[model samples]
Target chain A: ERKALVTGGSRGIGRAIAEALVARGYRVAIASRNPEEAAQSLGAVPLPTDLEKDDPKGLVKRALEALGGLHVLVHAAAVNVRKPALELSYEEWRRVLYLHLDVAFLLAQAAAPHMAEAGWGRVLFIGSVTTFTAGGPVPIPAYTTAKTALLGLTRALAKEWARLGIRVNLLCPGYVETEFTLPLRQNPELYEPITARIPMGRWARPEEIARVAAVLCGDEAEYLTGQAVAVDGGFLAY
Target chain B: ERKALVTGGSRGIGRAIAEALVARGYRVAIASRNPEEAAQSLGAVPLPTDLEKDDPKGLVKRALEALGGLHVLVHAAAVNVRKPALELSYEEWRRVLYLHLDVAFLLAQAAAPHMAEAGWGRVLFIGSVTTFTAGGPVPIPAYTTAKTALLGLTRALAKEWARLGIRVNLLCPGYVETELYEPITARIPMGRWARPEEIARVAAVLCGDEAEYLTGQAVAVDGGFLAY
Candidate 1:
């Protein structure tokens, strides 16, 4: 039986990912800051820890121990600071990068050995359309920088660990209608301009991101590694 | 009198860019960590700065304050930590990203205000074919990441700042022969890689009269790297 860990599984995209995995019959373990809430909502073994703290490795170890052995690690936990570069403080920069990039490294590093021992694993780093197109009007420099680094990390790890039966790839999602992006949808000026550009003419539902995630984690996507695949509804193509 | 800044301008591809700009008659300033050597070699005003600690605003301010105003910025300086990612330390990562990504950002930010005032400016970031295709047997992860970021940054900055008269673009050069790249050139599977002079010609053309329409685009000068 394949087992998985979906970080930030408490709400929004993370919740959707945990739900998707459960539907697919994977023994899903959900990790978030608030385990009780996630456990109540997700119905999965709730592993909770602050990703921003000095030791996120402990969470990964606990998750692995609970799951028995990991087959897939989905990094869906990310924070976005939408302020301009000049307006952002240094701590804000570190915090955003920590959530988006640092946590990713720690989680993946901790999970790799277990996956390698199990002889198969898929590590999917949830990237953003900003990985390619940047933001349309507002620029989140730290977010962009960290997401960009994930792409690099993806390629590097893929090349290094390919022979070991572990594949790492980036799943870049487009502008999805989530709590983090409600501000853009609320403002017509920003919202309308982007909708006009998107060929699909709609915000990506959380499931849309999950469907792609399921594909990447499935047996079919085994050959594809070290690539940043954008699920941006053709946002990058234009 | 339009002015431009070219780092690593002492020799190789940098010198070619300086000469190309000179031929086109733009007041070019060649900056190197070693200013005296750059002046002796490139025959342009030698401005020196450690790209490791590059202050984009200060660099542009000094250039414009000296030459009245600035119109263009080309970030051609880069470093390669040609090792596996595991062997690469945090400091190594910062050093490579600083020169390629951070320095480019600072320079663009600094030059943007002046370019906006003039209502015309070009910002070109020199990238690598490794961005699209991994270089040699071992991929230089830091270099590739920094270069790839430029692709995103180019598009982002272009969309945000285009109305302000500043255009951002990238030039991906493949296997350009230079003193810095000599070690890798020998290992290149391509029998003949691109010459630095050829890349300089493309840079000149990009900055020429016909290229005004080109913005937020990455032109691969590599010989069939991306195509393959």
Candidate 2:
């Protein structure tokens, strides 16, 4: 049976991914600070972890033990620091980088060898529309930096590991209606500019990102690697 | 005389801008840690500054004193921290951000009011092709971050100050000869790296009266690297 592990899989896009994989007949293990309820709902094994504070190797070990093997890895977890460049704190900067880039690296490093040995694997990194636009209605310097940097890592690792049967790709999502953006969605003045700018005329549902992610991780996207798949609602185009 | 301060003006693209501006009859001030020699050669004033350490207001004051009034601000100074994301350190990150983003902000803040009061100004920030591509042949996390972040600052300030007659723009150069030109030359469609003067000439036009209508633009003068 196919097996997968998802970080930040307890909620939002990650939760939707967990549900999607389960529906696709893959046994999934969710690693999150609070994964039990979401895991139960999705019928996935829960390996609760504080991704920022826990060792990635240990999480991989738990997931491997639970699933007996791992075929795919998805890193959709993120945090935003909205301060402008001048007021942004180093501590805050480090936190965002740690959660986004550092966690992505360590987790992938721990799990990719397993995929390589299996001779078949998929790795997807969740980036943002800010990865291209480099700005939003407000400033998110740390968020923008980490997402943009992930593209470098994505390309480097794909070029390095493609021959080993491991495919690395970045998925950049536009504005999505998730708990993360509840405030933005509720406020009309702040939301209007974002909605107006997106050529699709609306924000994405979490499932929208999950559906594309599932397709990218499946066998159909076997030829794709070192590329960024944008599920943006034409936000990048505009 | 129209006055300008070009940071990193002791060498490379910055040096070329100093020469171009001097030839255009602007009272130019070159601000680098060692600017005296370059300043003498270009017949420009020297405002030596440790851009990484000196307070931006202090450098602006020195340039204001040397050149009489500040009309244009070109932040072409930069440092590359080429370590991969996993290997990049906090100190190195801070250094690049300070030189590129912080200095750009502080210097513009200090110098633009004078231009706004006079109802005219051009603020040009030197960026890299990585600002758009988001990756290079090698890893440059801090360098990439700083350059990309500058775009946000550029757009924000341009929107805020355009009505005041202060135009802000970012100029991105690809594979210039002074830097890592050999290894990457094969990637550019033009089949050659650009000379510093090639970038400098564009910088000159962007800062001059002819580009008065251009604001909040991030134009790449790549040899078609971005197109590919």
The residue ranges of model 2 lying beyond 4 angstroms of the native Cα positions read A1-5, A25-33, A43-73, A81-121, A134-157, A197-201, A235-238, B1-3, B45-71, B81-121, B132-164, B179-191
Give the C-alpha lDDT of model 1: 0.77
Which tens-of-lDDT digit does each residue in B82-164 have in candidate 2? 77644655567667767887678788878877888778899999888867654555666567656766765676567657778
lDDT of each: 0.77, 0.81
Compared with the true structure, model 2 gives a TM-score of 0.77
Q: Which stretches of candidate 1 lie above 4 Å from their native place?
A: A53-59, A84-98, A102-106, A138-149, A197-201, A233-238, B179-190
Candidate closest to the true structure, highest DockQ? 1
**lDDT tens readout by residue for model 1, A116-152:** 8888888899888777756777667778777876887
